[PDB]
Design a protein around this ligand. Structure first.
Ligand code: HEC
Ligand code: HEC
Ligand code: HEC
Ligand code: HEC
Ligand code: HEC
Ligand code: HEC
Ligand code: HEC
Ligand code: HEC
Ligand code: HEC
Ligand code: HEC
Ligand code: HEC
Ligand code: HEC
Ligand code: HEC
Ligand code: HEC
Ligand SMILES: O=N[O-]
Ligand SMILES: O=N[O-]
Ligand SMILES: O=N[O-]
Ligand SMILES: O=N[O-]
Ligand SMILES: [Ca+2]
Ligand SMILES: [Ca+2]
Ligand SMILES: [Ca+2]
Ligand SMILES: [Ca+2]
Lengths: 520, 75, 520, 74
């Protein structure tokens, strides 16, 4: 049974923690629930750690007093199809392989499933670790609670004796790197310096061997990613988000200075040896838009290349951990701002960006966002009870499963079927434009080998490659973004029409150049 | 927000509660969750209650940390 | 009303039948239930047949004493979509036409439906008989009981006056031949010599006019295909299976000599004029893996060509009736063993194999097979009754329709939704690799015309054709096999990755050769 | 067996931390957890049928007990 420790004795050294803990809703929650610090207390000084105290990162540290939120969080939505490859005619991007050729995502890119699995899914996807990690057997794929208890309780490593990234099966890639983990877990929150910079007090950084890092990590989406464990107040912990909002002064709502002021973020920094080490961002309000934007954004978390001279940008560069914090129409400028692109297309040779799930940046400026609606209103609403203490659902999922709480409470004029029909109208229309965008991208891509072999000039191929960048960006934003346009249908429509326009321009350029070569 | 009280000071006069509280699974659950004893502490001796402290009997005193049991109960 | 005949009088000549009938669970079942032999008894000698007795092949011969098994067998699963072409974006092989071009399956290849329809579906598919046979009208497609009563009660022949295979509609093929029928019916069991060899006592053989043969056949999947009608004991009757297991000594479980001994097969031969004529294989146990492997295997049942010299292998050759009895990683060697391939790809000119529904060979070595699980456990389990005599379901169908009996009885740790989710995880992942395999095969195939027209050498095109064989095999196994990887997910994954690897190798070979030609 | 086994059993979750139901009610609302876990030989309808056989028989004897009490009282 837990025995409380004397918190005043801790606070003698830990004034920041004292200021947070004594004022918030965890003022009565003793340190022993999450820390074992006995030897630490015996050996620390005011400025030196002494023996390192143990800190619990497991979600069950919160489940004892908040069982309802924990149980809701770990639920598995079986209707969210698992391991469903997006590059197929019946999923999000029928022509993904041709369009993304040259990028690691061609090796596998499945649709998202329930949050319980995020860390295990990261470890087992074919593009990440060369097939090194697998579930212990194919039955463990169902075990959300198990994954939450710890990735290594349900996974196996094909070679515990080596720590290099390599292929264990032929059609895999080794794209994982330590930055990825920041959107899967924060078990390393005390072992990672802000941004993953090299730091004397950090065991792990952007330049770590990712297989060794992986082995030290266990829990998905820790409860404390949105909730400070000391104050119980709302926060974010993701360095890339704090860097965009605070360091770069862009604000929580870059398009709305007023809302940014009302719903802002305060950066709090913790030191090691009186040098800045790690940071969190306390939120003015419990604003799920910013909490969910710790992960549901477009980012760099990988090496790449410079647009200016084509040279390599490695994990050691700060650009390998970057939140663009830009909507689709500002993205190209944001990538120019850091002089960066992701890969060269295998067929066209164009410098291209790789876009990832930009839900937060898409939602900006939408009718719902402009009316003060936030991700949680549609995806983790309050539970409605005939008799009971209300709490907030923590099962983040499509609103189709709770339409009464997620839509119909605001849209009293609609039945559930009418609301679903409205969502499907947008998704059907947006998906048709994604498919047409891919058709035109594919037609362009197919012309590159023909043009090269017909002797079309480098100057013309380069003009086409410049068109490819835009045609790609204005399409791939939408296959990466998970709402199939629902989060911002006018923007999706404008962007996809721009993609098509750019592809058509490139097709015309290439056809005319091929025809001129043939005619000579 | 609740502010914890010095449970050790209570135990100087409440050995019977001490022997139950320190040993069980509520050893870390501060008295402030269920008692308002400020004036009691100001006025009591080990042999004189002084001001009567308040004791919460409401089920919500438990529902804060045990919402699932409470919600299932009130259905 | 049936009057019993004196079986002792039969047994005077038929000692093999006596030995089987008197010992098994049909010892009380009189010959008159299945044979009308009066004139036969009057005219036969110990070695000459005399007048030929009538033998009932219809399933209703068993339905009078086994109504529950019959009724379960003839049920139509309406959820198993009928006449659903596999070569479409929403079915098993979106790029099948490009990949299989040159083969008769390009004319039509639908998904399987309920067993009641196997013989009628064989007769009406566009690739089989030139469109000669059709249902009497489009309504008869629902009539499972009717098909069981007899194919000719629900079908019409466009020209009863001719017996040649020819096209009656432009986009059909005439791929059917007498070997096919052995996996649709055994009405011909007394009229077909072992392997379909020419034989004095056989009306039909591999070299028969298949339209005339077709007209003599009526019933699907006769009950006696798995059950000896004399002993009632478990057996197989399919010659190609007996030949692989017994004649070729490969065993019922080629990878497991022990299990092969415990669950073996005894070949019993019947003679005509004291010459071997036909054979059955009595099973040591009621082993559905081997019963279902009478049909759910990869086979030859068609003419083809020799790998060594390209020469024609016709229906007259024993290789036209062949069970490879090899898993996907042993198949190429099994085809080399008989010096055989199926067709030349219409675009690449590569010699290619044609793979068919290899469920039995895929299941070998899987976790379930290694634990003693068999096809019937998942696809035709015991019926569970609150009060009743238990019998075995004979409706062979997906376990999704009876998850309590087909999965959850062994997997007590799972709910139905969890079990379904586990199946779908494997199928989704496997299907994504099928789609990626087709993408890479298609990319290679598309390069052949470009390479030929650019003047790439025959030597390079031949190297690519050799890669095509493997790229094809390691893909097509999985579109042919009906479990979308569930029967052996690790093997499917390894094979599909091999397919992709081979295609990629061929693409690189061809691109480099085209580029070199252009550069000259 | 104790009252809680039939009237406030542990909750069964595909994924989650087990806790004890505190909704003290008839087992008819949670037959999987309140009966069928120990009575593997039964379906839900069989277990309900066994309950009802007892209650029907008992209620008949209650009614007959009242009939005779009332006859005496009159
Ligand atoms: C002064 C003598 C201290 C007392 C008493 C306690 N801690 Fe401490 N702690 C101290 C230092 C100088 C450091 C390094 C960071 C800094 O602020 O300079 C720490 C570190 C921690 C940590 C972080 C551990 C990690 O893995 O990075 C935790 C969780 C921690 N301390 C907790 C803690 C608790 C619960 C205490 C009372 C039981 C406590 N500390 C006493 C200095 C001192
Ligand atoms: C019991 C010993 C607790 C443990 C362990 C944790 N929390 Fe807690 N939490 C606790 C209480 C008594 C309260 C106040 C209840 C009230 O409504 O007065 C809380 C409150 C929260 C809140 C709400 C904060 C707010 O609204 O300002 C959050 C978000 C919260 N707690 C989260 C949380 C997390 C993430 C934990 C694990 C790291 C956790 N709590 C542990 C009691 C206990
Ligand atoms: C990084 C730690 C994340 C934070 C914070 C949030 N989400 Fe998330 N989400 C994340 C990942 C890595 C995944 C995929 C998990 C996998 O194993 O595939 C997801 C998934 C979702 C989904 C899909 C769920 C489903 O049923 O398929 C939704 C609807 C979702 N995420 C929404 C969401 C919301 C609303 C958040 C703020 C409350 C949120 N997520 C935070 C990574 C992270
Ligand atoms: C936060 C900015 C993220 C970083 C850095 C990484 N990922 Fe991620 N991932 C993120 C979210 C919000 C989601 C769910 C939404 C979606 O569109 O998928 C995911 C999902 C995954 C998945 C499951 C889906 C799939 O693509 O198969 C995997 C396997 C995954 N992520 C792997 C991954 C790797 C290898 C990363 C570093 C290169 C990486 N992620 C970074 C959010 C974030
Ligand atoms: C961000 C992606 C979150 C993670 C991870 C966790 N929770 Fe949460 N929590 C979140 C939001 C947006 C809210 C609602 C805030 C509002 O006022 O609208 C909550 C709320 C809580 C509470 C308060 C009581 C309630 O409303 O339910 C508690 C006690 C709480 N959350 C606990 C909790 C635990 C235990 C988590 C890990 C399982 C957890 N939260 C994760 C956002 C986020
Ligand atoms: C209601 C007004 C919404 C707000 C605010 C947000 N999202 Fe959303 N989201 C919404 C719908 C109607 C859909 C389509 C769901 C469907 O079933 O068709 C989505 C989709 C998602 C997804 C994918 C969900 C899935 O299909 O499994 C994710 C990952 C998602 N949305 C995330 C998300 C985030 C992070 C938001 C705040 C920035 C957000 N959504 C706002 C409805 C609404
Ligand atoms: C948060 C500050 C709490 C309040 C207020 C109450 N309880 Fe509690 N309880 C709490 C914790 C952290 C634990 C230990 C959890 C663990 O498993 O380690 C408990 C435990 C219980 C138990 C189980 C005791 C046992 O198994 O021996 C019960 C029955 C329980 N608590 C009941 C309870 C009641 C009735 C309360 C109101 C008077 C109450 N608790 C308040 C945290 C908190
Ligand atoms: C009634 C006159 C029968 C006809 C016609 C057929 N069968 Fe039969 N069968 C019959 C009896 C009385 C029994 C024994 C019942 C018992 O359990 O003792 C059987 C048994 C079978 C079995 C089980 C064999 C075994 O387990 O060893 C099978 C597989 C079987 N019968 C099949 C069968 C078939 C395929 C028939 C048509 C060719 C058929 N039977 C006719 C009674 C009668
Ligand atoms: C040759 C005589 C066969 C034997 C012996 C078995 N099966 Fe079969 N199966 C066969 C054919 C020709 C077809 C397609 C029928 C058509 O008209 O399309 C099938 C079909 C199945 C199916 C699909 C049923 C559906 O609902 O779609 C299953 C699940 C199936 N077969 C399984 C099966 C099992 C388990 C067997 C051993 C008990 C078995 N079959 C024997 C041909 C033959
Ligand atoms: C046993 C070794 C078989 C031989 C010889 C033939 N077929 Fe077949 N067929 C077989 C099975 C087990 C199944 C169901 C499983 C599946 O993958 O389809 C089938 C199915 C058919 C069907 C329906 C499905 C379709 O392809 O449209 C048809 C029309 C069919 N089979 C025709 C056919 C022809 C023309 C054959 C000789 C060339 C032939 N089959 C042989 C098992 C066996
Ligand atoms: C192989 C593809 C089969 C065909 C065709 C038929 N049946 Fe069958 N039967 C089969 C199996 C695998 C079993 C179970 C054997 C075991 O012990 O597990 C059965 C069983 C019977 C029985 C026995 C009683 C029972 O278990 O139901 C009877 C009487 C029987 N089968 C009859 C039967 C009839 C009448 C058929 C044509 C409609 C028939 N079987 C086809 C496998 C096969
Ligand atoms: C359970 C452990 C199984 C055993 C043993 C066998 N099969 Fe199977 N099969 C299984 C599943 C879960 C599936 C996918 C079904 C779904 O609905 O997703 C299949 C599929 C088939 C099919 C196609 C069925 C359909 O979708 O209509 C066939 C023709 C099939 N399996 C045949 C088969 C044979 C002949 C087996 C023994 C060699 C066999 N299966 C074993 C589960 C299991
Ligand atoms: C399972 C073996 C039981 C145990 C142990 C206890 N009870 Fe029960 N109870 C049981 C049944 C099947 C029924 C009839 C319910 C029905 O729907 O027909 C009952 C009934 C009650 C009731 C009335 C409940 C109602 O119908 O709403 C009460 C108040 C009740 N039982 C209380 C109770 C107590 C206090 C027990 C322990 C001493 C107890 N029951 C044990 C099944 C079981
Ligand atoms: C007697 C009629 C009870 C009342 C009133 C309350 N609870 Fe209870 N509780 C009861 C039993 C029989 C059990 C299970 C004991 C066992 O181990 O079998 C419980 C359990 C708890 C627990 C432990 C965690 C769990 O098993 O759920 C907690 C935290 C708990 N109970 C809390 C609780 C609260 C908050 C109550 C008022 C709403 C409450 N209990 C009433 C019996 C009784
Ligand atoms: O790839 N090295 O972590
Ligand atoms: O790949 N995760 O964005
Ligand atoms: O094609 N002749 O049967
Ligand atoms: O075409 N039947 O395998
Ligand atoms: Ca999903
Ligand atoms: Ca990116
Ligand atoms: Ca089917
Ligand atoms: Ca074949």
């Amino acid at each position: 049974n837990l025995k409380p420790v004397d918190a005043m004795q801790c606070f003698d050294c830990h004034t920041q923690i004292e200021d947070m803990h004594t004022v918030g809703k965890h003022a009565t929650v003793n340190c022993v629930h999450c820390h074992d610090a006995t030897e630490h207390v015996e050996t620390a000084s005011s400025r030196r750690m002494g023996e390192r105290p143990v800190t619990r990162m497991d979600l069950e540290a919160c489940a004892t007093c908040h069982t309802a939120q924990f149980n809701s969080f770990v639920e598995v939505r079986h209707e969210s199809h698992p391991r469903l490859e997006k590059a197929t005619p019946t999923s999000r991007s029928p022509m993904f392989d041709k369009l993304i050729a040259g990028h690691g995502f061609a090796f596998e890119h499945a649709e998202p499933r329930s949050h319980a699995f995020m860390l295990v899914d990261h470890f087992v996807v074919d593009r990440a670790y060369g097939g090194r990690f697998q579930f212990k057997n194919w039955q463990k794929v169902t075990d959300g609670m198990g994954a939450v208890r710890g990735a290594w309780t349900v996974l196996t490593d094909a070679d515990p004796e080596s720590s290099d990234q390599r292929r264990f099966l032929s059609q895999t890639a080794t794209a994982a790197n330590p930055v990825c983990l920041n959107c899967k877990t924060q078990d390393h929150i005390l072992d990672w310096a802000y941004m993953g910079d090299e730091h004397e007090a950090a065991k792990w950084s952007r330049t770590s061997e990712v297989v060794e890092f992986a082995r030290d990590l266990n829990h998905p989406l820790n409860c404390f990613m949105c909730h400070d464990p000391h104050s119980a107040g709302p926060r974010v912990v993701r360095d890339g988000l704090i860097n965009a909002v605070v360091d770069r002064g862009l604000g929580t709502y870059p398009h709305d200075p007023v809302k940014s002021e009302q719903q802002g973020m305060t950066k709090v920094t913790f030191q090691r040896g009186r040098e800045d080490f790690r940071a969190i961002g306390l939120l003015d309000t419990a604003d799920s838009n910013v909490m969910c934007a710790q992960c549901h954004v477009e980012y760099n978390c990988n090496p790449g290349y410079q647009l200016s001279d084509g040279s390599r940008v490695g994990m050691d560069d700060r650009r390998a951990n970057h939140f663009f914090w830009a909507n689709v129409f500002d993205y190209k400028e944001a990538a120019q701002e850091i002089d960066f692109f992701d890969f060269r297309h295998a067929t066209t040779g164009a410098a291209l960006p790789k876009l990832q799930h930009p839900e937060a940046e898409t939602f900006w400026g939408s009718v719902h966002e402009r009316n003060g609606v936030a991700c949680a209103d549609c995806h983790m609403p309050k539970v409605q009870l005939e008799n009971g203490k209300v709490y907030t659902s923590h099962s983040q999922r499509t609103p189709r499963d709770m339409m009464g709480q997620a839509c119909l409470n605001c849209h009293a004029e609609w039945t559930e079927d009418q609301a679903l029909y409205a969502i499907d109208y947008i998704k059907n229309y947006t998906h048709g434009k994604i498919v047409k965008s891919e058709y035109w991208l594919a037609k362009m891509i197919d012309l590159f080998p023909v043009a090269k072999r017909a002797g079309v000039s480098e100057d013309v191929l380069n003009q086409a490659r410049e068109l490819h960048y835009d045609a790609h960006l204005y399409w791939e934003w939408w296959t990466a973004e998970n709402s199939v346009g629902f989060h911002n249908p006018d923007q999706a429509r404008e962007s996809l029409m721009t993609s098509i326009s750019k592809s058509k321009e490139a097709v015309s350029l290439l056809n005319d150049a091929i025809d001129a070569q043939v005619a000579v």
